[model samples]
Target: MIQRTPKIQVYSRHPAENGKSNFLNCYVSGFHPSDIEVDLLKNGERIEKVEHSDLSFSKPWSFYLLYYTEFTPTEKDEYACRVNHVTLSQPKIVKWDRDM
Candidate 1:
């Protein structure tokens, strides 16, 4: 069996409101087996409240699935997302920063 790894990307949406309304997204794609876990963190602390969408196939010809999570961030806080899957020996982490 061929093992495929997911490409994790982190993105942030900076608005004028900063923490009050700003958000961040963690994207997981090109992964096999489909089952995966994603976590959102703030300043290295795990975040409990987060929004996620149902799994979606990348394309009809592609044998990959995508997952994402969204969270509201605070100014001057560092945000990160960790991904866990069978394909990886260790969890993958991605981070974004919001410094006023």
Candidate 2:
């Protein structure tokens, strides 16, 4: 059976004034069912192996729901459902330039 892959948004938000980097979190609530295996991609490749299932409505998952990954301007990457190995959407290129 084909797995259900939900759509997600990739954006940066400043969590703190002194924070060295912004947090990249995947928002899945907008989509109905609110469940999906959202993975973090790096350099056009998958970084974290684990898939994050949606937190139960009553459970209310903790903050930083997505895997912690350094946001790079120079580095390009993508993330999506990891089931059946089928890519959900096109790769998200890092528009900004960054230095290692």
Candidate 3:
């Protein structure tokens, strides 16, 4: 038997700008055993209206998931993605970053 820890990426669909409509994305991939949960959090608050890609698999059967939502980050709030999986005791949190 084998186990895999997931890789997490939190980013915006485009260059982020205050008061601009853009897509927030959280990409969780490279894990095994397909059992996982993802959440879009704005400064630790759960964003209930969110969407995602289908559970996908890659070589050696590692699984992946993509979560996205329409959120205009108009303030200096901490945007993050929380990932929960069987292999982790604490849910992993990833901060959102954008290129200038």
Candidate 4:
């Protein structure tokens, strides 16, 4: 089967504030094939203690997956989510903009 490119979203679970503990989430959706990689990152390095929700499908059978980790956002640090999939030309990265 042909692949469907994934859509990536990186955001905090709540209205984010620096120096506050929040759930950092990487929500990847509409990708074909259940196998994929979703990594939580801090300053481009993979963070530890991440967890993933079981893969699920949309009405069209495209897969969705969510990876998340507990993190404290800080003014001087960066947080992001990285996704790897067969359909990607390169790993997709989306940063969490705490300022938003």
Candidate 5:
């Protein structure tokens, strides 16, 4: 079996919002460079199923692009992202009203 390591990079700032939907794009790399499964968990609940990402890298050193969104971000809701069983980033409080 070939061992694959995955890297995680997140950009939670300055995201474009459309209506009730908000999109968050993350960068992933060092995997098999194939279809990867990712789960978006919010407030300790599985709101949706694991989404398969087909975005690929153009060349070596290029990471995979992941775009995640929440239809309606609840008030003071806790959010986190996971790649398989690994937590890419820690769950923190998010609010569009806050002065962050």
Candidate 6:
């Protein structure tokens, strides 16, 4: 049987103040299997600073949920997130850039 992978969205938000901290958010949603894995990367390397959410336990729901991770930029480097799920043949990658 075939299955559908989660939809991955990547983007960044501008800092309220110039030359201050900013946030990068990776959104993974709408898929099968509640257990999903998310990773944060910077310059092709895994980043330790990541804040993620847990699966919701509500009734009459699709059993599908959304997960996101946040990261702050402290330097000039490339950042991305990799999502792993059983439905996917391979990991789905989403890159975050300065443009947001």
| Top candidate by lDDT | 3
TM-score, predicted candidate 3 vs. hidden true structure: 0.83
**CA lDDT, candidate 3, residue 17:** 68
- Model 3 lDDT tens row, 47-82: 999965667787866888888988778567778889
Worst 10 residues of 2 by lDDT: 91-100
TM-score of 2: 0.43
Pairs in steric clash, model 4? none
Model 5 Cα RMSD, 1 decimal = 5.9
Task: Give the least accurate 10-residue stretch of model 5, judged by summed lDDT.
Answer: 91-100
Model 6 CA deviation exceeding 4 Å by range: 1-3, 14-19, 52-54, 57-76
Tens-digit lDDT track of model 5 for 1-100: 2334466554344435545445443455666535455555567665464343557665554446564553445568755555652222443322223222
lDDT of 4: 0.80
Candidate 1: global Cα-lDDT? 0.67
Rank list by lDDT: 3, 4, 1, 6, 5, 2
- Give Cα distance to truth, residue 20, candidate 3, Å: 6.0
Each candidate: what lDDT? Answer: 0.67, 0.41, 0.82, 0.80, 0.49, 0.67
Clashes of each: 0, 1, 0, 0, 0, 0
- The number of residue pairs in model 5 that clash at the backbone is 0
| 91: Cα error in model 1, Å | 1.2
> How would you encode candidate 2's per-residue C-alpha lDDT over 1-100 as one tens digit per residue?
2333334445555557657766554543322233334555554466663333344343233222343345544344443322211334653333212321
Of 5 and 6, the candidate ahead on lDDT is 6
Model 3: colliding residue pairs: none
Among all windows of 10 consecutive residues in model 6, the one with the lowest summed lDDT is 57-66
lDDT score, candidate 2, position 4: 32
